[PDB]
Amino acid sequence: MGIKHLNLTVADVVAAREFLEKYFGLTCSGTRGNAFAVMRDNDGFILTLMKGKEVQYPKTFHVGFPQESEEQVDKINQRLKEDGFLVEPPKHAAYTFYVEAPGGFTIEVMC
Amino acid sequence: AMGIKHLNLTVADVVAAREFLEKYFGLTCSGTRGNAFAVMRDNDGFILTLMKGKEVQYPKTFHVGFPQESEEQVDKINQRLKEDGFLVEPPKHAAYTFYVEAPGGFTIEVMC
Numbered sequence: 503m504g505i506k507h508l509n510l511t512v513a514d515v516v517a518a519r520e521f522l523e524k525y526f527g528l529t530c531s532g533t534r535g536n537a538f539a540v541m542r543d544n545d546g547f548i549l550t551l552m553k554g555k556e557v558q559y560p561k562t563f564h565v566g567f568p569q570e571s572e573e574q575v576d577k578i579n580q581r582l583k584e585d586g587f588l589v590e591p592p593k594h595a596a597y598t599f600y601v602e603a604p605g606g607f608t609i610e611v612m613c
Numbered sequence: 614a615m616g617i618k619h620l621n622l623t624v625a626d627v628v629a630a631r632e633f634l635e636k637y638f639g640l641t642c643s644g645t646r647g648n649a650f651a652v653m654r655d656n657d658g659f660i661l662t663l664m665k666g667k668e669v670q671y672p673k674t675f676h677v678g679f680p681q682e683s684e685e686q687v688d689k690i691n692q693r694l695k696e697d698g699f700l701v702e703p704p705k706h707a708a709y710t711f712y713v714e715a716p717g718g719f720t721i722e723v724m725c
């Protein structure tokens with residue numbers, strides 16, 4: 503089954519969880535207080551969030567959330583910008599942009 | 614008296630109601646029992662539990678209201694619901710209000 507789990511250490515589990523729910527439609531299947539949250543997508547990928555920052559992720563590190571259309575990429579970009587997150591217009595290579603998620607890791611959004 | 618702090622809202626589909634409330638209204642799920650039950654919380658500690666039921670119907674004028682800090686915020690939720698395929702009309706000055714038929718089979722009011 504290849505790669506199906508990522509344990510992402512973050513600065514703030516609650517903030518990272520709510521961001522992923524709002525913008526990326528992940529679902530939470532469990533928590534241990536504010537220390538731990540288990541997030542799932544539709545395909546059974548498990549992305550656990552774990553408190554305890556000592557260090558920043560390498561700057562090129564990112565997690566990618568593909569979208570069904572360029573319109574959907576634009577929509578997420580727009581709403582992030584409106585909601586106070588620091589984003590720039592997506593670029594055509596895939597049609598792609600990046601955002602820093604609360605918690606302290608970069609997300610790639612693309613079609 | 615400490616007032617009103619819980620609603621048990623019977624729904625047709627807990628999963629669908631939960632995800633809608635998370636996406637559009639920022640509620641947080643604090644627990645589930647399978648697909649039958651979910652405990653949702655708002656920022657002020659109100660507890661909204663969603664409970665699967667059969668043949669769920671509410672009186673026509675029943676609704677749950679989510680007040681907003683500004684009329685611009687009302688517009689934003691309206692616009693996003695519309696773009697995302699929910700049937701909403703523009704908000705009206707009656708409070709500045711609109712309604713939406715929510716997943717799970719109940720009406721939500723959004724106002725300032």
Ligand SMILES: [Mg+2]
Binds near residue numbers: 564566610
């Ligand atoms: Mg990449």
Ligand SMILES: [Mg+2]
Binds near residue numbers: 676678722
């Ligand atoms: Mg009302």
